Amino acid sequence: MKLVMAIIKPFKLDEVREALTSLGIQGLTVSEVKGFGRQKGSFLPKVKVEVAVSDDQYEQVVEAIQKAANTGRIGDGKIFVLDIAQAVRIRTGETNTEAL
Amino acid sequence: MKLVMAIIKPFKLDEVREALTSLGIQGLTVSEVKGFGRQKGVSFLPKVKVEVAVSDDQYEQVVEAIQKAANTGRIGDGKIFVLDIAQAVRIRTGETNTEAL
Amino acid sequence: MKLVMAIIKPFKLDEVREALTSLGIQGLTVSEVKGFGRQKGSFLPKVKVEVAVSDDQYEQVVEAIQKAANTGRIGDGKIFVLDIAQAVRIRTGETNTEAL
Numbered sequence A, C: 001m002k003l004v005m006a007i008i009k010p011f012k013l014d015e016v017r018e019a020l021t022s023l024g025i026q027g028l029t030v031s032e033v034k035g036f037g038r039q040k041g042s043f044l045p046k047v048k049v050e051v052a053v054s055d056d057q058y059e060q061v062v063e064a065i066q067k068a069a070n071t072g073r074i075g076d077g078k079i080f081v082l083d084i085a086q087a088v089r090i091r092t093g094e095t096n097t098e099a100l
Numbered sequence B: 001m002k003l004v005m006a007i008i009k010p011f012k013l014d015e016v017r018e019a020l021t022s023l024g025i026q027g028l029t030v031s032e033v034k035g036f037g038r039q040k041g042v043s044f045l046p047k048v049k050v051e052v053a054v055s056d057d058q059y060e061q062v063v064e065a066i067q068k069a070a071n072t073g074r075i076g077d078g079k080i081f082v083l084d085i086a087q088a089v090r091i092r093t094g095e096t097n098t099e100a101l
C-alpha cells in the first residue's frame, strides 16, 4: 500500500480530483500548506494531497496527479510515495486495501 | 517505531486524546484538513489529522484505542494509516529512538 | 531518500530555513499545526517542516534543524525521518534525487 503525497498549485486541485475520481479513487485528504522553492512569489500557498492507494493503482495515480497538476512552469510541485504498513477503516474495522 | 496517522471527525479529537493519554502517550500533533469521501456535506468536510509517533511495543494498542475512540459507525469516520519511522530525535535533548517519544 | 519531518516552535522557522539554505537545500513544505505535549499553554501552535532530502544529506539536515530549532526549553518538538520510496518533480517528470 502506498501513501501518495502531492504538493501542488492550489488552482489545480479540481483537475487533480477529476483525474483521481476517473481512476475510481474513492477519496483523499487535503491540507493547506506553505511552499518554499525556486518559484518566485518567500513562499507561495500550496495544497497537499494525501491519498492512500493500493500497490496495483499507485503508479496510475501518480501519473494522473502529475498530468493534472503540471503547467510546465516552475512551482508545480512534487509527488512523494511512502509505503503504508497497515491501514484501518475506522467505521468498519476493514484493513489493508479494504480500508480504502 | 511507527507514525500512526489518523483522519477523524473533528468532534472525536478530545476522546482520541483522552484514549492516548490513558495509554501513557505523552503528546501528539494535530492538523486541520479537508476530507473528500463518500460522506455528504459540499465536496469535502472538515476533518482532523492526528499524527502520533509510537514505539513498536505500543503501536497496536494505540491503533485500537484510536479506532474505538473515533468510531461512530456512521459514514465518514475516517482512516488510520501506520507508517514506519526510521529515526526520531527530540530537539530539546537530542534523545533518539524511543527515548525521543 | 528521506522525508525529514520536523515539528518546531513557530518563531524558529526562519532560523531553520536559513540553516537549510546553507546546505543548498532548495525547497521545503511548511504546515501550521497544533501541538499537544508537556509544554503548558490544551495545545500550542507549532510548525511542521517537511523536506525531502537525499540519503547523503539527510543526517546533516537533521543536525541543522536540531541546532536551529533548539531552545532548551520544553516544547521544542521532534524530528522524524521516514523513507521515501519514489519521488517525482511534476514539472519535468524527474525522479529520485533529481526530483528534489
Ligand SMILES: Nc1ncnc2c1ncn2[C@@H]1O[C@H](COP(=O)(O)OP(=O)(O)O)[C@@H](O)[C@H]1O
Binding pocket: A007, A034, A035, A036, A037, A038, A039, A044, A046, A073, A074, A075, A076, A077, A078, C026, C027, C028, C029, C030, C050, C051, C052, C053, C089, C090, C091, C100
Ligand atoms: N526538498 C523538498 N521537500 C519537500 N517539499 C519541497 C522540496 N522542494 C520543493 N518542495 C515543494 O515543492 C514546491 C515547488 O518547488 P519549486 O522549486 O518552486 O517548483 P518545482 O517543483 O517546479 O521545482 C515548493 O513550494 C515546496 O512546497
Ligand SMILES: Nc1ncnc2c1ncn2[C@@H]1O[C@H](COP(=O)(O)OP(=O)(O)O)[C@@H](O)[C@H]1O
Binding pocket: A026, A027, A028, A029, A030, A050, A051, A052, A053, A089, A090, A091, A100, B007, B034, B035, B036, B037, B038, B039, B045, B047, B074, B075, B076, B077, B078, B079
Ligand atoms: N484513499 C484515501 N486516502 C487518504 N484519505 C482518505 C482516502 N479515502 C478517504 N479518506 C479520508 O477519510 C475520510 C472519510 O471517508 P468517507 O468515505 O467519507 O467515510 P469512511 O471512512 O467511513 O468510508 C475522508 O473525508 C478523507 O479525509
Ligand SMILES: Nc1ncnc2c1ncn2[C@@H]1O[C@H](COP(=O)(O)OP(=O)(O)O)[C@@H](O)[C@H]1O
Binding pocket: B025, B026, B027, B028, B029, B030, B051, B052, B053, B054, B090, B091, B092, B101, C007, C034, C035, C036, C037, C038, C039, C044, C046, C073, C074, C075, C076, C077, C078
Ligand atoms: N508522540 C508524538 N508524536 C507526534 N508528535 C509529538 C509527540 N509527542 C509530542 N509531539 C509534538 O512535539 C511537541 C512538543 O512536545 P513537548 O512534550 O511539549 O516538548 P518536548 O518536545 O520538548 O519534549 C508537541 O506540541 C507535539 O507537536
